[PDB]
Structure 1
Amino acid sequence: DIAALVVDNGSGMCKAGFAGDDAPRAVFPSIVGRPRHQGVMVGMGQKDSYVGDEAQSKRGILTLKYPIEHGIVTNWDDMEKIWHHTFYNELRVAPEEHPVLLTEAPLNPKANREKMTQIMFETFNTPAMYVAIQAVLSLYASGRTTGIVMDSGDGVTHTVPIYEGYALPHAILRLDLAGRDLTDYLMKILTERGYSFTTTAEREIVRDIKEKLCYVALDFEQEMATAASSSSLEKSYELPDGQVITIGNERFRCPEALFQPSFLGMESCGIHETTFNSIMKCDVDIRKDLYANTVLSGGTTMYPGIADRMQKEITALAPSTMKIKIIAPPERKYSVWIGGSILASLSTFQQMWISKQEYDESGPSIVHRKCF
């Protein structure tokens, strides 16, 4: 009927809900788990593949695979499983009664969104759908019309400046650097202390450590000198078997990769230089407004002390006269979903859906012209 579904099915965590709400109804990690041991106990609830929280709980005897990586969908069967579990189990609502509004990172292979449309119209049989750039929605959520937004999800980072509603499509920048790579770097640097997490089941433990102890340093060299001459920066985390580990210097060497990709052997610049360059790509007269309306977004920007570091870096790069204001909302994990909800609930948006008849008339490729 109405209240189209909003499914921010980005990398790392799928967040689905109804339009007109202020919070996603069901958020869960988008992983597919398959058992890697033979079953011996018959009639004990043996299923072939777990998805979401079911896989997270029983991850001891499962191999976990993310169907998304860096923003592109690599295994479409697992993605179909994820969408099915989202619709029927985590929401208990048929897909052929509501439109759906997915999301996509900018500068993405067109085959991705084409297959998204084909799946949404031929497997789940939705009456309509739409695809939006996650940055534009995150800007919707903040209730602004001007500003640059630097989203950073599980596997993709991207900056999209928008002035007075006109997004500059030539200044949109992308950088494949996000949670996934930080969790790999942490798994690597933890071996320095002596902790070895190798299997995909322990990657979740390392991710829980990263999203509980890590923090962005306001001055990397000074924090490194401090953590090397004291023990006031060490924190102890307890593995789920009783073992307790203590991480010190590592806590801020993991997120620092965001500002120095040279750690990961990447040539690209940090996220601060990425945002500054994205701003400088735009016309002169607007470079002021963006300076005062930098809007962080994505889970990877939930590190304590990232707003201050970004502000310091930018105000050290930008001219001294201009003002720098980092609009880091209290919550920004669901900001993309909040913006998607606000967009779907708009009354002027009902003329922009991709209708079933339109897909049956023009095939999947219509998504290239109906959606921006």
Structure 2
Amino acid sequence: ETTALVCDNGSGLVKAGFAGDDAPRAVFPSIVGRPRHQGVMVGMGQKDSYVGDEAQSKRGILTLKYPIEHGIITNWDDMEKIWHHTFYNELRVAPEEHPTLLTEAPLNPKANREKMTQIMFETFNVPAMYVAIQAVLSLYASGRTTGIVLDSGDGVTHNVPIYEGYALPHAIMRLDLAGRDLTDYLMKILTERGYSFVTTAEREIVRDIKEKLCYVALDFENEMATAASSSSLEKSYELPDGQVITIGNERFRCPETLFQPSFIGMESAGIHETTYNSIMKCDIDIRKDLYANNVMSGGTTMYPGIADRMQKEITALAPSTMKIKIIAPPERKYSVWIGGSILASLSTFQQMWITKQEYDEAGPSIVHRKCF
């Protein structure tokens, strides 16, 4: 087959499509949903498991399980359904033709990458495949060969410093604070204004609140004082069922978890200090070009004001001698997939696939030598 698929099966929201396109062919929630009520209508297409946009649409009668937790596949029985849906339902291409570029977060369990390779060769029969790292693909989308990626998906936030083509694996920082945990924190603080959301169906409404209204404050303490001179920062959101909810300092006190992880009680650097600590693990001659080439990526980097709050805080930690030149491109909602759509299309990369003939003499253990 001439064309590769690239299939960023990432947490919360899969991206999939052919290499050499400039955007994903399909994007849908990485959700398998199962009925939670007594079926009664005989004579109907009643179905035992919905997946993707079917599960997102019918959700008022479903329990929703994401099969991926913090970038690790935790429910293979349902992860086969998400890949099966991805290839047979709306890409609608037989995997026996197209080789496929998958993608993984850095510092994942080796057992995940093995079992992921096995399913692709033994349930889908793809002629060849590869497992690039979510950060390394982002520099191809930016057109760079040096930078520090901050990638922050639904399930994981991570940094991978890269200089003039080489990744620095001792300086990789992985943090499990991401777009999911902000959604659970928003379900928690909305309780203190009197709105209760608790079902896995209602968590999707709280995700739509988070996406439509949140922003990152340029200076959180001054913003908290500004919300006490109240009603200038408040917004209304219109729930399904048409009840409005009004939302105030909890509009920006949600994304500030990224800069102050003690709000969700976990002990870590915020995303500003984790990027700065990663730059400070790099060899001293490269740091000037890492500060000049700091690259945002992944859906959590879409909030209004996050490029400014990030630049403000790295500029406070770094010496005033030199300039942080953060790049937040407008496509960064999909830049990992766009990166894989370049990588799978390179003429030099066609040597690097794991092929069916190279797998079956080596088993799923092959993936650790030929990949990152």
> By the TM > 0.5 criterion, same fold?
yes
Task: Give 1:181's aligned residue.
Answer: 181
Q: Distance in 2 between matches of 1:231 and 1:58?
A: 36
Deviation at 1:306, TM superposition (A): 0.1
Q: Distance in 1 between matches of 2:230 and 2:55?
A: 40
Q: What's the CA shift string for 1:69-113, capped at 9, x where partnerless? A: 101010001100000000000211000101100100000100000
Q: Distance in 1 between matches of 2:146 and 2:84?
A: 37
Q: Distance in 2 between matches of 1:176 and 1:143?
A: 27
Q: Distance in 1 between matches of 2:327 and 2:369?
A: 32
Deviation at 1:38, TM superposition (A): 1.5
Task: Give 1:247's aligned residue.
Answer: 247
Q: Distance in 2 between matches of 1:87 and 1:239?
A: 33
Deviation at 1:280, TM superposition (A): 0.5
Q: Distance in 1 between matches of 2:211 and 2:43?
A: 38
Q: Distance in 2 between matches of 1:304 and 1:257?
A: 15
Q: Distance in 2 between matches of 1:3 and 1:132?
A: 17
Q: Distance in 2 between matches of 1:57 and 1:72?
A: 25
Alignment of 1:16-165 (within 5 A): 16-165=16-165
Deviation at 1:331, TM superposition (A): 1.6
Deviation at 1:3, TM superposition (A): 1.1
Q: Distance in 1 between matches of 2:212 and 2:326?
A: 23
Task: Give 2:332's aligned residue.
Answer: 332
Task: Give 1:349's aligned residue.
Answer: 349
Q: What's the CA shift string for 1:247-304, capped at 9, x where partnerless? A: 0010000000000000000111100000000000000000000000000000001010
User: 3-state DSSP class of the match of 2:111?
Assistant: helix
2:364 is aligned with 1:364: yes
Structure 1 regions of 5+ residues with no counterpart?
Answer: none
Deviation at 1:167, TM superposition (A): 0.6
Alignment of 1:169-248 (within 5 A): 169-248=169-248
Deviation at 1:308, TM superposition (A): 0.2
List, as ranges, runs of 4+ consecutive aligned residues in structure 1 with deviation greater than 6 Å.
Answer: none
Deviation at 1:322, TM superposition (A): 1.2
With normalisation by structure 1, the TM-score equals 1.00
Q: Distance in 2 between matches of 1:41 and 1:12?
A: 31
User: 3-state DSSP class of the match of 1:170?
Assistant: helix
User: 3-state DSSP class of the match of 1:326?
Assistant: coil
User: 3-state DSSP class of the match of 1:38?
Assistant: coil
Deviation at 1:206, TM superposition (A): 0.1
Q: What's the CA shift string for 1:116-164, capped at 9, x where partnerless? A: 0000000000000000101000111000101110000001000001000
With normalisation by structure 2, the TM-score equals 1.00
User: 3-state DSSP class of the match of 1:162?
Assistant: strand
Deviation at 1:223, TM superposition (A): 0.2
Deviation at 1:2, TM superposition (A): 1.4
Structure 2 regions of 5+ residues with no counterpart?
Answer: none
User: 3-state DSSP class of the match of 1:221?
Assistant: helix
Give aligned-pair identity as a percent.
94
Q: What's the CA shift string for 1:3-61, capped at 9, x where partnerless? A: 10000000000000000000000000010000011111112110000000000000000
Q: What's the CA shift string for 1:286-342, capped at 9, x where partnerless? A: 000000000000000101000000000000000011110110001201100010000
User: 3-state DSSP class of the match of 1:121?
Assistant: helix
Q: Distance in 2 between matches of 1:32 and 1:323?
A: 45
Deviation at 1:230, TM superposition (A): 2.0
User: 3-state DSSP class of the match of 2:360?
Assistant: helix
User: 3-state DSSP class of the match of 2:158?
Assistant: strand
Q: Distance in 1 between matches of 2:123 and 2:266?
A: 39
